[PDB]
C-alpha cells in the first residue's frame, strides 16, 4: 500500500531467505586463518618469493578499460621461445607458463621478453648440490641474500 | 535465541465451542502439559515475541576522518589540567601534566622500578585511588565473568617494545598504547575526553610526525592535515571586555521593572 511519493520498490524477500542467511562473523577469524597460512607458506619456501612466480605484462580487453595493465595468468610459449627458456624449465625456476595465451601484437611481446630477460639477471638460482654444478651461482652471491621478496615480484607500474 | 525454542511442540488450537479461548494447546496425554497452551508469547513456555536473531547490526563503521578527529581531541584534552581533574585523576603533585620521560623507561624489565618510577613522578596516587576503588560489580554481571570492577589509571604511551609492557603490567589501571596504534577507546573511556597520560621521549616527538602542524602534512599518513578551528579566541571574556566592542555597545538596561 504505497502512499505519497515513494519509489516502486521490488524487494526480493518473497522466498524463505531466513534459512539461507550467511552471517559474516567469520571475517576476522578467516583473515587470521588466511594470514597465518600465508606466513606458514612463505616459511616453507625460504629463498623463494612469497607471492610466487612472475606474472606477465597484460593489457585489458573490454574497451571500457582499454588502457590498464594487469598481472596475467602466465607467460605464453611464443614469449618463452624468444627468451630461450624451455617451457618445462620455466615452471621449475619460477615463471608462470600457460599454453592458451595468443600473441597478436609485437610491442607487447617485447614487453614480456624484456620482463623475462632482466628477471634472469636478478634471479639467484641455488645449486641442487652444496658443491655447485655448472650454470649455477657463485658462493659470493648467496650470503648477502637470505630474505624473500614481500609483495609481487617486479610490481607492475602503470 | 534458538529458532527451535517454542517450536519443538506440535500444538494446534481447539476450535470454537469450548470454554478455552483459542490458544494452540498440547494434544492429549495424561500429562501436566496437556491442553495447556503453546506457540504464543503470552503462554508459559512457548516462543518469545520477536526472537533475537544473530544477524542484528552489531557493528558500526565510522569514517576514518571522524575516527581520526576524536583522537586529536582526546590527545589535546590530555593537556588543560581542568579536564584531567574533572575526570577524577589526582594530579596535584605532578610537576608537569605533559609528562615526558627518557627512553630508558623502555629498557625496564621489572615492576619494582615501574612502581618506583610513578612515585618519583608523583603519579602513584592515581593507582592508590584505583586500589581503593576495587569492589564487587552491582547486578548480574558477577556470574557472567565480570565479577570485579575498578577505576582506570594513568595510561603510558610507549614507542618501542623493549620491556615497558612487561613492567607496567600487574599494576592496576595502566594501559599501554603504541604510538602508531593509539586507541580512542582507551584515550577517552566512557566517552569523556579527560585522561591522564604518560609519554616517553620517543613517543612525544612522534606526535608531530603522526599528524604534523596545520602548515605541514601528516608525513606518515597519506592524506591528512589538522582540522581547521571554527574559532580562535575561545575565551570570550576578553572579547566582550575588549575596548573596541564596548565602544560600539549601547547603554545597558539593568533597572528591574515590576508589575
Amino acid at each position: 500500500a504505497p502512499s505519497r511519493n515513494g519509489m516502486i520498490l521490488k524487494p526480493h524477500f518473497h522466498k524463505d531467505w531466513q534459512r539461507r542467511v550467511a552471517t559474516w562473523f567469520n571475517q576476522p577469524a578467516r583473515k587470521i586463518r588466511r594470514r597465518k597460512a600465508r606466513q606458514a607458506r612463505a616459511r616453507r619456501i625460504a629463498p623463494r618469493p612469497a607471492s610466487g612466480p612472475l606474472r606477465p605484462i597484460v593489457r585489458c580487453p573490454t574497451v571500457r578499460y582499454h588502457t590498464k595493465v594487469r598481472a596475467g595468468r602466465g607467460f605464453s610459449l611464443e614469449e618463452l621461445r624468444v627468451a630461450g627458456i624451455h617451457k618445462k624449465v620455466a615452471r621449475t625456476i619460477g615463471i608462470s607458463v600457460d599454453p592458451r595465451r595468443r600473441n597478436k601484437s609485437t610491442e607487447s611481446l617485447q614487453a614480456n621478453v624484456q620482463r623475462l630477460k632482466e628477471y634472469r639477471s636478478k634471479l639467484v638460482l641455488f645449486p641442487r648440490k652444496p658443491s655447485a654444478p655448472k650454470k649455477g651461482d657463485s658462493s659470493a652471491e648467496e650470503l648477502k641474500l637470505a630474505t624473500q621478496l614481500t609483495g609481487p615480484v617486479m610490481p607492475i607500474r602503470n | 535465541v534458538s529458532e527451535l525454542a517454542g517450536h519443538q511442540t506440535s500444538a494446534e488450537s481447539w476450535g470454537t465451542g469450548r470454554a478455552v479461548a483459542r490458544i494452540p494447546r498440547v494434544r492429549g496425554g495424561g500429562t501436566h502439559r496437556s491442553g495447556q497452551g503453546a506457540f504464543g508469547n503470552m503462554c508459559r513456555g512457548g516462543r518469545m515475541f520477536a526472537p533475537t536473531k544473530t544477524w542484528r547490526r552489531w557493528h558500526r563503521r565510522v569514517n576514518t576522518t571522524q575516527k581520526r578527529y576524536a583522537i586529536c581531541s582526546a590527545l589535546a584534552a590530555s593537556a588543560l589540567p581542568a579536564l584531567v581533574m574533572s575526570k577524577g585523576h589526582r594530579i596535584e603533585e605532578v610537576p608537569e601534566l605533559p609528562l615526558v620521560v627518557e627512553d630508558k623507561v623502555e629498557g625496564y624489565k621489572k615492576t619494582k622500578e615501574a612502581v618506583l618510577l610513578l612515585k618519583k613522578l608523583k603519579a602513584w596516587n592515581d593507582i592508590k585511588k584505583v586500589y581503593a576503588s576495587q569492589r564487587m560489580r552491582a547486578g548480574k554481571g558477577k556470574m557472567r565473568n565480570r565479577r570485579r570492577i575498578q577505576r582506570r589509571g594513568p595510561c603510558v604511551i610507549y614507542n618501542e617494545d623493549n620491556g615497558i609492557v612487561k613492567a607496567f603490567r600487574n599494576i592496576p589501571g595502566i594501559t599501554l598504547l603504541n604510538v602508531t596504534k593509539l586507541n580512542i577507546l582507551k584515550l577517552a573511556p566512557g566517552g569523556h575526553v579527560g585522561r591522564f597520560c604518560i609519554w616517553t621521549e620517543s613517543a612525544f616527538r612522534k606526535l608531530d610526525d603522526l599528524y604534523g602542524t596545520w602548515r605541514k602534512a601528516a608525513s606518515l599518513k597519506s592524506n591528512y592535515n589538522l582540522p581547521m578551528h571554527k574559532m580562535l579566541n575561545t575565551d570570550l571574556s576578553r572579547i566582550l571586555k575588549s575596548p573596541e566592542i564596548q565602544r560600539a555597545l549601547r547603554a545597558p538596561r539593568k533597572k528591574i521593572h515590576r508589575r
Partner: protein
C-alpha cells in the same frame, strides 16, 4: 591475568572442575602450607595433607595453639579430621568436625620414600627460578 587461551577463567567452568574433580586431583587441591621452621629447611611452600600428619589449627572456632594428628582424610567433602578437633553430639557421642586444608599449617610431615622425592623436586624447582631470575 592469564594469557594462555586454554585456561578456563570461567565462573561455571572452574566450579565444575573443582567440585567434580577426581580423587587424584583432589589430593593436589587439598594442599597445606608448612610451618615457618620447615620452610627454611625444605624450601617448600605447601604440600598436600597426608594420613598421619599432625596439625596446628589456624582459623575457626577451634583456632588455637594445640597440635593434633590427622585422624583420616575425607576427600569427598574436601576436608580432613583432627584428633582434638571434635564436637560432642546430643547423645554424648563425639563427632570429628572437619577443618579445611586451606586453614591448616603442618608442623611435621609423615615421611616415606615417596615423600622425600617430592620435597627435593619442589625445592629443586625453587632454585631454578632463583638462578634464572637472578
Amino acid at each position: 591475568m592469564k594469557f594462555n587461551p586454554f585456561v578456563t577463567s570461567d565462573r561455571s567452568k572452574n566450579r565444575k572442575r573443582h567440585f567434580n574433580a577426581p580423587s587424584h586431583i583432589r589430593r593436589k587441591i587439598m594442599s597445606s602450607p608448612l610451618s615457618k621452621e620447615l620452610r627454611q629447611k625444605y624450601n617448600v611452600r605447601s604440600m598436600p595433607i597426608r594420613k598421619d600428619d599432625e596439625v596446628q589449627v589456624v582459623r575457626g572456632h577451634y583456632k588455637g595453639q594445640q597440635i593434633g594428628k590427622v585422624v583420616q582424610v575425607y576427600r569427598k567433602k574436601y576436608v580432613i579430621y583432627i584428633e582434638r578437633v571434635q564436637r560432642e553430639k546430643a547423645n554424648g557421642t563425639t563427632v570429628h568436625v572437619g577443618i579445611h586444608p586451606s586453614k591448616v599449617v603442618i608442623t611435621r610431615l609423615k615421611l616415606d620414600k615417596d615423600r622425600k622425592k617430592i620435597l627435593e623436586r619442589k625445592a629443586k624447582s625453587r632454585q631454578v627460578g632463583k638462578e634464572k631470575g637472578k
